[PDB]
């Protein structure tokens, strides 16, 4: 018998299966899971600045609807809209609603820059029983419902604001579509109204349309919400013969800013995570995740697979 010396390697009792280019099931000593499958079940309020809309969606928030007052001057990285949000004010619709939501979400702020306006020849601060605040008739806090003056006419409206500042302004305004001709004349004298809002470079003109619409909060008429941007240097004119829902000022557009809105259900926790999904927060170093394709922040990329094991050891050959 001569001495022998053998070279070998380690082997554990229980290996882990990985895939390779040629094999579905190959047992190795150790492996790491690359697909994150777990989330927190609460939204973490840090490091991202969250604002919870609770019962207002972002637009009701921007218009100043009754449930929304706590959202004034709010600023966010991510605004959270709740599936429990409800309309509380005069029924309205927004042509290209989605784009207004997108533009608001993106600017990241509900801090209103209030403005003095002189609306000549009309009653101001119109209120409605479809918009109750503390049990009393009220309206969108950011809008001004004008009607005809005590003595008669809707003195033609023609008011202008110059953008003196260094930021792009966003102006929110509306048109009232009444349910009858009685109501049209009762409110605006003129049989047929007109609202024209314009800058040096863009313009919108709306003739309101009468008729009965299903009753909401007892109301058959509607307000259509429009918006106009105004660059530094430009001006905006509000020209109306009737039916103008007037602005009380404007919002500041900070463009291309890391801000957004997340439609989620989960409560805001006290955890810390740089990654929010509609399903909860992800706390993970894994390159991939399957929790949700709605992922905001520093997140693993969404993939379909529920598992991808990376081998981190040699073939496991016990026995």
């Amino acid at each position: 018998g001569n001495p022998i010396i053998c070279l070998g390697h380690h082997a554990v009792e229980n290996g882990t299966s990985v895939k390779t280019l040629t094999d579905n099931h190959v047992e190795v000593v150790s492996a790491k899971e690359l697909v994150e499958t777990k989330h927190t079940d609460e939204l973490c309020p840090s490091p991202l600045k969250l604002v919870d809309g609770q019962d207002c969606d972002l637009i009701n928030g921007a218009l100043g609807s009754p449930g929304c007052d706590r959202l004034q001057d709010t600023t966010w990285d991510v605004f959270i809209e709740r599936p429990t949000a409800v309309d509380t004010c005069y029924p309205f619709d927004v042509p290209d609603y989605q784009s207004l939501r997108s533009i608001l979400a993106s600017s990241g702020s509900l801090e209103f820059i209030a403005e003095q306006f002189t609306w000549n020849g009309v009653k101001v601060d119109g209120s409605s029983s479809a918009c109750l605040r503390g049990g009393r008739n009220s309206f969108f806090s950011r809008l001004n419902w004008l009607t005809k003056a005590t003595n008669g006419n809707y003195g033609p409206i023609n008011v202008t604001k110059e953008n003196t500042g260094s930021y792009v302004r966003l102006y929110l305004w509306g048109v009232h579509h009444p349910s009858s001709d009685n109501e049209q004349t009762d409110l605006y004298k003129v049989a047929t109204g007109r609202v024209t809002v314009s800058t040096r470079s863009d313009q919108i003109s709306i003739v309101p349309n009468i008729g009965s619409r299903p009753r909401v909060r007892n109301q058959s008429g509607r307000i259509s919400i429009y918006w106009t941007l105004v660059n530094p240097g430009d001006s905006i004119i509000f020209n109306s013969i009737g039916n103008l829902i007037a602005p009380r000022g404007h919002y500041k557009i900070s463009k291309s800013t890391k801000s957004t809105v997340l439609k989620s259900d989960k409560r805001i926790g006290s955890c810390t995570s740089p990654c929010l999904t509609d399903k909860g927060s992800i706390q993970s170093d894994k390159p991939f995740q399957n929790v949700s394709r709605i992922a905001i922040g520093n997140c693993p990329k969404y993939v379909k697979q529920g598992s991808l094991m990376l081998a981190t050891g040699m073939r496991n050959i016990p026995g």
């Binding site: 001495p3 022998i4 390697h9 380690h10 082997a11 190795v28 890391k258 170093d285 990329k301 050959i317």
Partner: protein
């Protein structure tokens, strides 16, 4: 594996090697013993760690994106927004599948390679003093006490000391 050393001419691994990935098991006039090889274990661990840190360089940070769920049919724009997202998810799912498969192919070949480099290293230290037994073992054709075994393990073994003895045993 490309080298046929792990799951190859090394029949199996040692469950008792708990302090290394690769090692020496010997038999001599004084008995038997197992020790870990540090260089070969370290070379494998470094390469695996290297490829793991590589998989972290984290460059996925997105805020305002597009909507991904919808409350109502719309037609044209919605079709596009969904097609865009579905196209994106398929391509990333494909990237991750291939990345893992090919990474695993490679790691297994690397680990098999490092086993083989250890075998080859010792083959070269022993010169004409030993013969390959076919199973990851060398028959050493001279007395080799514990100090001599350790000199093989730490790469100070000088084959010339044992050469005449070994070559003589090799030949009857």
């Amino acid at each position: 594996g490309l080298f046929g050393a792990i799951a190859g001419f090394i029949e199996n691994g040692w469950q008792g090697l708990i302090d290394g990935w690769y090692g020496f098991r010997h038999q001599n006039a004084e008995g038997t013993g197992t020790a870990a090889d540090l260089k070969s274990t370290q070379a494998a661990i470094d390469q695996i760690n290297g490829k793991l840190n590589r998989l972290i360089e984290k460059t996925n940070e997105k805020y305002h994106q597009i909507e991904k769920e919808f409350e109502q049919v719309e037609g044209r724009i919605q079709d596009l927004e969904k097609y865009v997202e579905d196209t994106k998810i398929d391509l990333w799912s494909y990237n991750a599948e291939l990345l893992v498969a090919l990474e695993n192919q490679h790691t297994i070949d690397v680990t098999d390679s490092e086993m083989n480099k250890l075998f080859e290293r010792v083959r070269r230290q022993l010169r004409e003093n030993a013969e390959d037994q076919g199973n990851g073992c060398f028959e050493i054709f001279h007395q080799c006490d514990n100090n001599c075994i350790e000199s093989i393990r730490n790469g100070t073994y000088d084959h010339n000391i044992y050469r005449d003895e070994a070559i003589n045993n090799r030949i009857k």
